[PDB]
Amino acid sequence: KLLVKQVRSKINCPLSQKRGLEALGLRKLGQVVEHESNPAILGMINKVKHLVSVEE
Amino acid sequence: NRIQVILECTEHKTSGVPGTSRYITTKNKKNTPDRLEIKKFNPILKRVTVHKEI
Amino acid sequence: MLQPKRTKYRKVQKGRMKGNSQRGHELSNGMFGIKSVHEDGMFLTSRQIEAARIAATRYMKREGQLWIKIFPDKPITKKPLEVRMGKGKGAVEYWWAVVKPGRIMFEVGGVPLSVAKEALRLAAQKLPVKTKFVVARDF
Amino acid sequence: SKNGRESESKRLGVKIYGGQAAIAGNIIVRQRGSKHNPGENVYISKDHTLHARVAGVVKFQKKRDNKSYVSIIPF
Amino acid sequence: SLTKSERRQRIKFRIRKTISGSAAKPRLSVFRSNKEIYAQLIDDVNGVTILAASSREKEIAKGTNVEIAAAVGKLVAEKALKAGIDTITFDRGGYLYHGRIKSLAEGARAAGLKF
RNA sequence: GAAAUAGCUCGUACUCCCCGAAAUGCAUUUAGGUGCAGCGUUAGUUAUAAAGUUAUACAGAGGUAGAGCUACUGAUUGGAUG
RNA sequence: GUCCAAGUCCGAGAGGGAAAGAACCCAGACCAUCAGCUAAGGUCCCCAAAUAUAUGCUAAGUUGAAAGAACGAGGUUUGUCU
RNA sequence: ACGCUUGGUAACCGUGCGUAGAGUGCAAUGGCAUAAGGGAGCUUGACUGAGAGACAUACAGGUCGAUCAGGUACGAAAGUAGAGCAUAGUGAUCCGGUGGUUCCGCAUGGAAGGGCCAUCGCUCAAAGGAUAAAAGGUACGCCGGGGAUAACAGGCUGAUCUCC
RNA sequence: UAAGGUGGUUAUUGCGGCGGGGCUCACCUCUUCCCAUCCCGAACAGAGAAGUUAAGCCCGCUUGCGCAGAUGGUACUGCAGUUUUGUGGGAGAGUAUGUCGUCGCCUUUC
């Protein structure tokens, strides 16, 4: 179980990377969501890792 | 030179059967003269018959 | 001037030269040469090629050869003056060769180092490229 | 100039791929010349178009001097 | 392809391009040669051969090659109409349908083996 | 007649709440206008619901970047034969 | 400048920074408050915050905004071979 | 490539090497030798009634196509044939002409005429064709709009120019 | 064990060279008949068994021509910032090297 929180803004990001955030439970810069560690979510984190921060 | 020919059935129009069978084909007025005749299926008589160019 | 005797097409599109030519950067049949150390591709024209060749041939009068490892194979066009933009491509103006960073252009085999450095330095002043003097490893 | 003419594209390319299902009359490949040859349960048309014959799964399986032989595994 | 074998392989290729056979309705290949003509029933979809006949057994009477081929055809027909095979696709194996091949085919047609 | 017609310019009056585009494609006596498609709003439908979006695993067809030409077509530097 | 393709923004978008700029960097404004934490960018004064710490370079006011050539030189610091 | 009178290595012939450099009517691309290239025999499926299912898709349109029935051509039979190796060779509607048709036919019976199927007439070439039928001047001009668009000047860039 | 027939496997399976073999395969002898040459029994077809491994065919060897081909490195490229780069993917060519096939079913044989 890892915690991921959006640190940057999706205003100048492409549509793919902007939908990659909505795929997770992220809709605002002040949010933080907890997910599992399956290999499916660590492709979304790799897609948008410059916009989020994964603590644990 | 390529003309449009109309091959009408020949054995038709001799029996008491209304209708007329025709086939609209193309030909050449120089390479194949003299009223081409071809055996085609007559849909009225239900048998193959010789159709001659009109 | 160096240009093809004939070719399939007269007009050729002006492509994009991405540098660091990975072929033609080694010396062969000659021990001294000049190589391009520029940062982007260049168009070496037949006038520049002939000028550099004759400048390097006037030096070292009859000693050694001058290998030219390049050829102006592509045609560059230019529409006439006082013409508005766009009625088709213009007539072929001249012929040029693509030179990418790392390509060797001239080579000398006969003369020693003292003369081959001066001749190549005299020839490199006619080319629009920053050139460095390279010597072969087996020397 | 004298160069301003062209024709409309024919929308060629590869239809249903070698891992998807087809049915009795689904166009598989549109070509200009038989570069994808028909295999099992796949036939070719007048315009060198590959048609399916039965419902199944497509399979290309290039072989025999680099020649595609599109076939269908029934299911 | 003119060595009397490549010429036959070409015919066999352009015949097998359309002649085949499953477990039901198999293929009937023939091999001529200078003497002792052979015939065989092959299943091309699964490998295994069903049956095979030849003019080398205690059933063929000596004579002309045409009569020998007719007898071999009758024998292979009577042998194939035992298990239940009723239809066949007769190919040629690169031989013209005339002479011993036609005699074998007619000897098989006089019996059963609908084809 | 007559408030002729204007594919043209100008003007178009109170408040609050919710949603929210386009400047593309095909035609046109057509290009600063329209017709249809594309994008919007309102309402109603799929339920043991269906479809969408992103990522992962698996499986496909391609001929771009690159590369090469003694692998064709065209071009091409230098030596040996002639 | 012009004609296409893959994205973003302005168009229809307030706020902060580059001194002032529709697009550049950060960032998507329901109101009210003399509350707090940060992004880009900064902490000598105009003008909020370091005349903060550690190491080296520059002597040209180069520089403190953006942006420069072929070609010269016994400016200086530093690594290897010699 | 090697031999041979004309005959000349570019005519025909003989023997080898030759995966395709030939040819496929006509441009280019793709394909084709187990031929789609060439020859011989027999023939007319260049048939009738039709279209499971797909590809393109604003619409109008366009392309491919498997089973069934009735009679055929070739083949011993399987089997193939609903035009050409495949993509260009084209023109909507209205109107008029020809062949077939107790389909209708204005009180009744005919007829004129119309309807249905097959088919003909348009460089309507400005080829989605505004009419069957169509060229110029205006410095005597007028009205409605445009910096959507030029001439002078300003702006960006130097092809040209000038200087180093 | 050997041979013949017939299939699967993208030439690592092919081409060439050197030696061996023949119950089946092949040349080999003839054209009255079935059949055919835009001329020829050359090919196809038929009738036979005097001879033969000479050739076709099958075995064993050959890196010779072909075909296949790494590891490493490089080019190129998706995402993020930028003069620099970091993260992943990763060629082509070339070198070492490999290859004189392999897998089934029937008939006669040991």
Short mmCIF file of C-alpha atoms (C1' of nucleotides) in Angstrom, two decimals, chain B residues 11-19 44-45, chain H residues 101-102:
data_model
loop_
_atom_site.label_atom_id
_atom_site.label_comp_id
_atom_site.label_asym_id
_atom_site.label_seq_id
_atom_site.Cartn_x
_atom_site.Cartn_y
_atom_site.Cartn_z
CA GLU B 11 -36.30 -19.59 -81.93
CA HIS B 12 -38.49 -17.25 -79.88
CA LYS B 13 -41.38 -15.27 -81.40
CA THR B 14 -42.42 -18.46 -83.23
CA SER B 15 -44.35 -20.18 -80.42
CA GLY B 16 -47.44 -18.94 -78.63
CA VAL B 17 -45.43 -17.54 -75.72
CA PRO B 18 -45.51 -13.80 -74.93
CA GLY B 19 -42.19 -12.05 -74.37
CA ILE B 44 -38.65 -17.46 -71.03
CA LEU B 45 -38.30 -20.88 -72.67
"C1'" U H 101 -46.05 -6.37 -70.79
"C1'" U H 102 -55.28 -7.41 -70.56
#
